[PDB]
Symmetry: D2
Subunit: 494 residues, 4 copies
């Protein structure tokens, strides 16, 4: 069942968080924060800029110094702190899910049952790794004793998008903190509020000051200050391809800091004639429409074998026509608004390109309502590979359905993109499932499902959908720096 907050949500935490204390901006400037379902201002937040990032980095650098509490405490106690933070987020789950929905335009049902549960589970997963991060002893040639330390990197700047503010906050700080790093987090200008509430819980849990610093503010200002900072050792980012390129360039020009990126995609589904048809239609539908299409792994190209193409298209339209748009906090509402004017304009412009370029509009195709950034759920059939809605990430509720008959050809078409975040394969054939998934150039391939993401699985893109992996055992590698120590000895023995 779906419990709700029984009193009005009151916003309390609006300031910059550095050394576990609340700071005004150095400039004194604040910026507004809006509800995307009403277009109304929720509150003002301190606007961080380069001078505020500079204060946060100095705090994170001090907290990382040899001999500091965060460097010297047991790894198991790092894990304890993360498990306590997860307990506190669970305590404030109603508050946090409500704030996430109100600020992010996110269905409250999903915010409470999915985002908040993913936050809690991911933190608990990360807490468990803290004292299980291990180096090696190595049988080097010669009379030496050689071991490795998988040390924390140091100060990690982490730039977060607006589509999953809480989940992405925990995906970033969970592994970084578990490995022993300190962090300077820059939440999306649209959605700083839940991150600042989590900062209050980081204080309450007892993390040493400066281990986690949060600087709300804008991208070209605070974000660029992070990417180009001379004392940040690593930057992690999730968001647009364009900013990703900006970050890697600024990183190259400044101090060659380590960079990992996750940059969205144009993820394809291949539905073979032998697929469980109803299962494939349902998973591909949710794959493209989840969170109003504002998901990096959106299943935005669905290739269906000709023998079943028309049935797939009809059943997808039937399912797309069943949505209730409105305020994401009202029960029964099944689609909320897009985040803001920029994304809203982008979706409408791409929908129009689909009409003009000759796609078949099966349903939707325009805006909705008198307030809020709402877009009708839209289905396009007979899409071809050269159309804009086939090539560009839309980040809206816009589904593309294509036909194929040659399996060889559709794999090339699925791979013919600079993106490569995820893919789906729907078939009952063992051999096809293994060989197709091996052939797709995508970081996660789902077979007979879609959008299944768990803390135990590494997640990240092939090609221009990004570099590096998050979560799972493998993701923790990107938050460590390996040191080899080689000691001369009189005689070694195996």
């Amino acid at each position: 069942d779906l419990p709700v907050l029984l009193t009005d949500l009151k916003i309390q935490y609006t300031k910059i968080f550095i050394n576990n204390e609340w700071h005004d901006s150095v400039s004194g400037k604040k910026f507004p924060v809006f509800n995307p379902a009403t277009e109304e201002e929720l509150c003002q937040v301190e606007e961080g800029d380069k001078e505020d990032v500079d204060k946060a980095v100095k705090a994170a650098r001090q907290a990382f110094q040899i001999g500091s509490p965060w460097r010297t405490m047991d790894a198991s106690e790092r894990g304890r702190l993360l498990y306590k933070l997860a307990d506190l987020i669970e305590r404030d789950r109603l508050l946090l899910a409500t704030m996430e929905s109100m600020n992010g335009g996110k269905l409250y049902s999903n915010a409470y049952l999915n985002d908040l549960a993913g936050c809690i589970k991911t933190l608990r997963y990360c807490a468990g790794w803290a004292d299980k991060i291990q180096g090696r002893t190595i049988p080097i040639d010669g009379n030496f004793f050689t071991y490795t330390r998988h040390e924390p990197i140091g100060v990690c700047g982490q730039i977060i998008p607006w589509n999953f503010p809480l989940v992405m906050l925990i995906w970033k700080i969970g592994p970084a903190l578990s490995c022993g790093n300190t962090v300077v987090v820059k939440p999306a200008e649209q959605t700083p509020l839940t991150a600042l509430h989590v900062a209050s819980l980081i204080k309450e849990a007892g993390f040493p000051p400066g281990v986690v610093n949060i600087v709300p503010g804008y991208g070209p200002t605070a974000g660029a200050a992070i990417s180009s900072h001379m004392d940040i050792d690593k930057v992690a980012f999730t968001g647009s391809t364009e900013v990703g390129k900006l970050i890697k360039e600024a990183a190259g020009k400044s101090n060659l800091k380590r960079v990992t990126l996750e940059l969205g995609g144009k993820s394809p589904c291949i539905v073979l004639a032998d697929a469980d048809l109803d299962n494939a239609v349902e998973f591909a539908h949710h794959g493209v429409f989840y969170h109003q299409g504002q998901c990096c792994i959106a299943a935005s190209r669905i290739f269906v074998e000709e023998s079943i193409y028309d049935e797939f298209v009809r059943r997808s339209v039937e399912r797309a026509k069943k949505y209730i748009l409105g305020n994401p906090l009202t029960p029964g509402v099944t689609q909320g608004p897009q985040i803001d004017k920029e994304q809203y304009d982008k979706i409408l412009d791409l929908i129009e390109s689909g009409k003009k370029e000759g796609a078949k509009l099966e349903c939707g195709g325009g805006p909705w309502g008198n307030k809020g950034y709402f877009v009708q759920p839209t289905v396009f059939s007979n899409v071809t590979d050269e159309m804009r809605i086939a090539k560009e990430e839309i980040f809206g509720p816009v589904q593309q359905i294509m036909k194929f008959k040659s399996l060889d050809d559709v794999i090339k078409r699925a791979n013919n993109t600079f993106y490569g975040l995820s893919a789906g394969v729907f078939t009952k054939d063992i051999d096809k499932a293994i060989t197709i998934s091996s052939a797709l150039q995508a970081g996660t391939v789902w077979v007979n499902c879609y959008g299944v993401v768990s803390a135990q699985c590494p997640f990240g893109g092939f090609k221009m959908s990004g570099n590096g992996r998050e979560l799972g055992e493998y993701g923790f590698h990107e938050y460590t720096e390996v040191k080899t120590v080689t000691v001369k000895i009189s005689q070694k023995n195996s």
Copy 2:
């Protein structure tokens, strides 16, 4: 193609191998070695007993001493020696395959193309791990530096069966030597000859003396001397369930040495109605008949869904009726003899139990020829779970075919055995393949194939088919002894 030796095979190495020198038995006694296809003596071999094992253990213990060449050389040089040994076996492949066939009653085609290639590949695989065996550095609670050494165990006694003399020799010494152990090997009394030739190549490759010692001789004498020896750290064994129990008991009574066992099985195949029928028939046929049925992973219970049962039975009989029995060295011969009188008697007695207990004899069912331990390839249909040929490992060319209709029931029937070495599943359904293989209590489960064994895969039994794993990354664990070293330090840092 299949090259052959162009001169008569001459036997040269017949003595006990200790400290890289050839020893007569302490007793002076020798024992005969026979060709199972002719029942004629090939040569005499020095008979090792407890006093000879005692000399070999003293040599292996000396070679393992701290400061010795084998303990102090680079791990990478241990690997070099193993790769050189593989090169030398490849050089003597014609000789070794011929000797293996003549002594072991093994088809020369298989001996040359399969056993010898598996020997060479497994050695090269093991050589690659030598300098990649690594311990850990561990973020222990408190102000300590903790690391682990994955040391060699020490002197490993290794008792080998007669069905795959060379392959089992390399499966044992490859990992043991790669990890840095020293070994005392006791080949089967039936088949000492190829092991002694390999000992000549261990000398030629340059292994330090005492690293590999080979003591030919009998089970209750030399083998029991190994299992009960007070200075052997580990015993590894492949052979009968009965001896396996004898070894573990003697190990418990003496010095609590580590024991790993592989003890054969009664491995089942489940063939669902949707299986590729011809593929399933061919793999199950070879699965049961390979090397005259003298294989631990023999597919000796084949459960076939009723809808296709009669077709499966007919096609299996058709395939079983196509064999040519004779001397395993003559080209075109496709089935050789059983190893000796004991195995021959055991197979005939079990075949007769099948007739008496009411199985349907589809073909074969008796002995063959005027010399050699030959048994007609035999197929039984309508087998039921209480018959002796359903319960006891036969180790002969005797195939059992059963029907089922309830998938739930046939999994229980497949699991209703104290054995658990391997199983096969034949289906085109993705879900069935994953769920059935997860549900079978067997160490290796093949899907739409059978008998696929490679150096990269751990191999071993569930339940009374044995303990521990051989080969793959996981197998190397059983040839190391973990030491934790914990050092007090003034202050640790992550």
Copy 3:
């Protein structure tokens, strides 16, 4: 600080725990449980025997069936249950530490601050591994897809000693449960009480019924029923060498179940002339006297370089003369009783052998008090390697101090034992610390400390001190069974 229970301890849980319900013994028989400090009966407990073990195994087998709640729940939820159990033990820490002290004769200060903290930390460590136990995907030769499952083994019988009842209970059930096994636990007849209280918390935490079963009772009865049971897949044991041999023999005779043993030791310390002398004296003192000497890793042979031998002996005697014997619940008491009459008699008989065989009695040497199994802390100097107190594990407060001058010789003397659980090295020289620790045949080697044991470190013996490892990453291997699944595919790609 050291909080205490503010009301009398009342014993509640005295029955057999099977399927999360409390059972009387099948026989109806109960046995008494005593306080070793007073020799007074505390309560009666249901006496489990073979028929009760048979009920527990049937319950554990049912809970392990494919499709059961414990097999199908998320690994992460297995970890959740373990973290909840740790929370509950932390809640009942005062109760549990008091009961442990009263039943086990264990100083309350240590019981509360060390045993209970080790229980809580080890459980939390084990909970973190549950969803991080992973198999492999393997690049096998040929056109196949090969992966491994690291499955739970199944029903694990776990026999626990009386010296660390709670800690050993958690060391056994923590890893077993984290890996997904079900367990049948047989606590020491002397000390069943804390295990039965933990069983009440296993119920409260919500573990599915039959996942943990606890059968109090005696060794030759309930314990032998476990070792010889035909449907227990693995037995783990900590206790005497003699029973260890009995278990491995019964395991070999019955169903070849997997066995791991930890069997105590005769652990040596080597103190070089350059050692921090006061540091070495203090660590070696606690190493031998901890928990009245009833510790497997007791530092029961201390070899000290001649130049500093007399100073080491004097300082050790000074420290040994500072103890206060009495009831382990009274504050300020620094040594409690031995567990029972058998251990008490054994210690006194070995002390007398030391006197007769010519050791120098520096202090102690006899019993103490009018009630309770108390032994004066005893120090022997000028011990030689042939004396009984040099060879046999004493398990009492009896310290042996020896001199050496040849480092080569003292390493041989340190290694000249069938035991091999642990060792200590005290030196300021880098090279000596690495080379000596590499040369000692012991499972844990401490450098400039002793007795440092943490959940992150594998723990176990070389030689006759046992087989296998507990805790750390490596310990989890012994609670999994590896299954290789190899799937035929049309074409593989790297």
Copy 4:
């Protein structure tokens, strides 16, 4: 001993290597290649540019296609090919060492005994990993089967410097090929010759065409074509900080290809008063002077405790005054030339800055000879942290020696650099060795030695000395791309 080539070296391979065939440049242009010891031209080589890189990438992309020989062959056969290549380089060791010395200005003794042995050993190490690169099976939440493939990335562009042409060629292609990638290699314009000879051996070994392509040519032309290429998946680079920044920027602007860099350093040694003084002087001397100082790990800041500073300085000068300069092919010659005019000018300009800024010139300080880019081995004492020779990587035979008395302060001074490739610690104190090495921000820390690099150890920089690691188990991660495959199943079991 040191064998030599008995006939004149004849240069044969001067063309671009693509698809295992020799190509002229698309332009027709060639460039000269010089001997740095004589300043004389050795031969002309085809000059590759963007059009040639484009041909090589197309070939490498074709060789990486699903279904190709390199994608479908057994991993073990990838390893076979690498071991065969190592055999062939060993066969041509005299030829290759001579060519390396003549083209690279590298002492023949080192070229034959060190570079060529490192090439052979590193290849054999890499060959062993090929079929031991494994993914995971993961106990994900929900009813799913999840596994990972550690796939090759794809086409890897690899830009090589002139100081270790062969060793760096093998460090790049060894791991890349072992993991299954295809490569486009751009050797230094100064030193293309040995790489082209190795290309002839790649053909001879039987690597499929297009797996290894080598495009000799210049940095701003062929190198920039690689860094900015839209179909190269990863670029690896070793060389200057400045080019490293250029590569990462071009990578960010083009296709966000993965980048790893190794960029030299300013590596410090800390010599405590208790150090073995002669051992520290010898290791620090070779650490700074190896290969005429043209080593990334040059020990270019040596901090010595005041009590022993003057003795360290004298002994270092004594050792530096014992060199024989001349042609690196003549026996007895112990220092060769610098690579070219640019490096030569840079060294002399930095030597002069040392004089002007007030360092104490102990020996050397100017050029040498009438031909060749020779520099006298130069020692500076009383260096301070603000001088250019303290801050800038010199890449010449120029040693800096500094004093300290505060250990806290000297660690800060050691860390006060944007570099971070390596460091050395010289002390006999266990605690100091562990705590100092933990505190240094450097990728490899040697204790009581220096410059010990082996194929089993990961190697790479902290901070602006680069990102990622090469060699060892950890280095192989950077040549794989992780794919998560998650399959819906009816019910999972642990």
